[PDB]
């Protein structure tokens, strides 16, 4: 079954977006149709997964003679799925037998004929709270368009026989012929590997049909759904033939345009008008200049003065294509916390042709760019900052990428004064350097590194988190790893490299609970008992 997501213009758009649609995964919106403007523009739609909004219907008959189940993955305002109000002489909804989630609101329809006699008790189920049916089993069209009462466990609309392989519309989902209460599971647990593994028999879920592959522009979601568009917190990644809704690593990639190329093409600086167009943006393409006229405000460009707290909108930029010149920062702020996450200033286009990450004539305490890793092409001139001390520590050669890149960090707070005032890298910071004057803002960690922090010693033997060093970086051992006092509590990450199990230990794995009722191979749920030694024994 094919699936689809001015008065004359409305008629054309509706007839286009619902011409051959059989199951409308979106919401049927048949509203504002002038008299004698359509003819069966949507007649075969057999299940709409949302709200059927039939309002402002001047036409005598919008057929909708096929819709049998209006799913209810939304509502009009609340619990309102079929919105038949403010209309229309006859609507043959003889097919609609079950609206799974929601209720029907009828009113403001003087022309509505034969609709009041509908036995709407069978239509909606258990959501009668907003059943505003105030505006004989027959949904119009005289006889043979009867209401066909059926409601007054995997079959929703009706039964073609009491067999789960023969049902009109699936209550939850349908693999191919039998309607299952859930999709064919994406990954099944194999007791041999003692872990869940991708079952070949499993299929992704598309609407109400379990699909082996996500068709057309559909991406597999985390919950297994074949969503047409990935969520805002997710990203589209193609590892197999079907793209997957991989969750975003913090700020999702939203490549905005920078000050100089794009909508901000002729802007002079990051004006208060220019800002807030870069919110929730990463990998700005072009420069990200922040000149003094931004905080002063401008008239000949009619730019209102920028509130200092709004410069934190630029904290999500994890890369830049062109230069990143920060030539004036809010004076009350000690460190360039605006660019605290800029991971690589690729510097394809260099401000003044030379500088790629320049921080000139600011009054910051520390460069504050803890997270920077590669200033690829252009140079790096960080001068003028008369109160920046913990600057020269970071090795300006480990960062720059093209051998022609130079560095002119000069004229800042003196090294002797930086040392006398105690403005030095925290002891738990390797000789590589420290971007800020604190321990977490260190270029390289001396011994271990719990997260971004450059700790002095990982909790290898004593500690609350039970750290277990790995590639010179502390990593929280799996919570199931019971801390061990004699030696290291965890050889490596994952519950299969732990010394002592806090909870039961299931085979090579230390699991919070033994696998009980988890679906395994051969479509069998697996229930495992636990031994006295915290060993999970399968039943």
């Amino acid at each position: 079954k094919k699936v689809c997501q001015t008065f004359e213009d409305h008629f054309l758009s509706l007839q286009r977006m619902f011409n051959n649609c059989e199951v409308v995964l979106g919401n049927l919106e048949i509203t504002y149709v002038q008299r004698n403007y359509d003819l069966s523009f949507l007649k075969t739609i057999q299940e709409v997964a949302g709200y059927v909004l039939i309002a402002l219907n001047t036409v005598e008959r919008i057929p909708l003679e096929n819709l049998q189940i209006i799913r209810g993955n939304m509502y009009y305002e609340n619990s309102y799925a079929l919105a038949v109000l403010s209309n229309l002489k006859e609507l043959p909804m003889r097919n609609l037998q079950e609206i799974l989630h929601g209720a029907v609101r009828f009113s403001n329809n003087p022309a509505l004929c034969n609709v009041e006699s509908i036995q709407w008790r069978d239509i909606v189920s258990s959501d009668f709270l907003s059943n505003m049916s105030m505006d004989g089993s027959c949904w119009g069209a005289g006889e043979e368009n009867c209401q066909k009462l059926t409601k007054i466990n995997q079959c929703a609309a009706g039964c073609t026989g009491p067999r789960e392989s023969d049902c009109l519309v699936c209550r939850k989902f349908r693999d191919e012929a039998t309607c299952k209460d859930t999709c064919p599971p994406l990954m099944l647990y194999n007791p041999t590997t003692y872990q869940m593994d991708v079952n070949p028999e499993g299929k992704y879920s598309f609407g109400a049909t379990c699909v082996k592959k996500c068709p057309r522009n559909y991406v597999v979601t985390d919950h297994g759904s074949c969503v047409r568009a990935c969520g805002a917190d997710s990203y589209e990644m193609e590892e197999d033939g079907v793209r997957k809704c991989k969750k975003c690593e913090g700020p999702c990639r939203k490549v905005c345009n920078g000050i100089g190329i794009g909508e901000f093409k002729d802007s002079l600086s990051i004006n208060a008008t220019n800002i807030k167009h870069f919110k929730n943006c990463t990998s700005i393409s072009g420069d990200l200049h922040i000149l003094p006229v931004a905080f002063r405000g401008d008239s000949f460009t009619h730019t209102p003065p920028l509130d200092p707290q709004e410069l934190d909108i630029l904290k999500t930029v994890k890369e830049i294509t062109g230069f990143l010149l920060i030539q004036a920062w809010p004076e009350n702020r000690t460190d360039l916390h605006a660019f605290e996450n800029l991971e690589i200033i690729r510097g394809r286009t260099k401000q003044h042709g030379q500088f790629s990450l320049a921080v000139v004539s600011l009054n910051i305490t520390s460069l504050g760019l803890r997270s920077l890793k590669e200033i690829s092409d252009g140079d790096v001139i960080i001068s003028g900052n008369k109160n920046l001390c913990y600057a020269n520590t970071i090795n300006w050669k480990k960062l720059f990428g093209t051998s022609g890149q130079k560095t002119k960090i000069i004229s800042n707070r003196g090294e002797n004064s930086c040392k006398a005032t105690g403005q030095v890298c925290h002891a738990l910071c390797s000789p590589e350097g420290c971007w800020g004057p604190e321990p977490r803002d260190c270029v390289s960690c001396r011994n271990v590194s719990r997260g971004r922090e450059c700790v002095d010693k990982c909790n290898l033997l004593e500690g609350e988190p039970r750290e277990f060093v790995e590639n010179s970086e502390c990593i929280q051992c799996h919570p199931e790893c019971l801390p061990q006092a004699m030696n290291i509590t965890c050889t490596g990450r994952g519950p299969d490299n732990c010394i002592q199990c806090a909870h039961y230990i299931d085979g090579p794995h230390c699991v919070k609970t033994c696998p009980a009722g988890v679906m395994g191979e051969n479509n069998t749920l697996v229930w495992k008992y636990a031994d006295a030694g915290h060993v999970c024994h399968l039943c």
Epitope: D266, L268, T273, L291, P292, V293, R296, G297, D298, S299, F300, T301, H302, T303, P304, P305, A328
Partner: single-chain antibody
Framework: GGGQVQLVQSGAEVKKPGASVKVSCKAS????????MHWVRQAPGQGLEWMGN????????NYAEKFKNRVTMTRDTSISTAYMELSRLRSDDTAVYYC???????????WGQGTLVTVSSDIVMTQSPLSLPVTPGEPASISCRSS???????????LEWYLQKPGQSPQLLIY???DRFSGVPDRFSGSGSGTDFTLKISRVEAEDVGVYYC?????????FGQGTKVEIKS
Amino acid sequence: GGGQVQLVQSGAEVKKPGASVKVSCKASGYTFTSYWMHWVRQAPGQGLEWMGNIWPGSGGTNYAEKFKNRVTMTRDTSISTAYMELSRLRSDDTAVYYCARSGGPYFFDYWGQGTLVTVSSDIVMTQSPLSLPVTPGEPASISCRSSQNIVHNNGITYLEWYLQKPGQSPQLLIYKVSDRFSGVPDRFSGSGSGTDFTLKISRVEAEDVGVYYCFQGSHIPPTFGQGTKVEIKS
């Protein structure tokens, strides 16, 4: 002096018809690359008519419609100075040309000395009074009408009332429609709304005698009024 922001213009230019003149406004006491050295010209018998901005640091100049093909403005960030060259000098282009410096909320904050270039062979704001005389101490009032609504889309009505005191460069006297700039006496306090604006000098002393040109820059080309030459009763 206190190295206060003090633009200084070239001055004393006399040309021949059809020639070109280049003017330079040597800035001082400011970051000459952070303030748009907007230019403005008021010919004998005319009000403040902008000649097109600049961004002295980047050299990227907007320009004035009636001179877009004749006036090119290029900056020299090294010498801390803006330069604007007017080409094909006609007869009607003989004037005194000033070099403003668009401030934060107050355009043309620190106007230069002004160069007199004599070569000889748009929201329209008109000032209600003209040569409006008042007696020493007598309250006065100059009003001005806007061709359109001069409240900008930004919501800040960039109307202002510069006050060219006799013999000096124009000097802001109302930063916005209502607020007064720092250094103006409490007497001069105008107001207005919509398209009508009026300055009301509370007590016209001997210090307020001079053409009070009224500018409105909320529209793209910065166009001012003709201004009412408030003069003493005499």
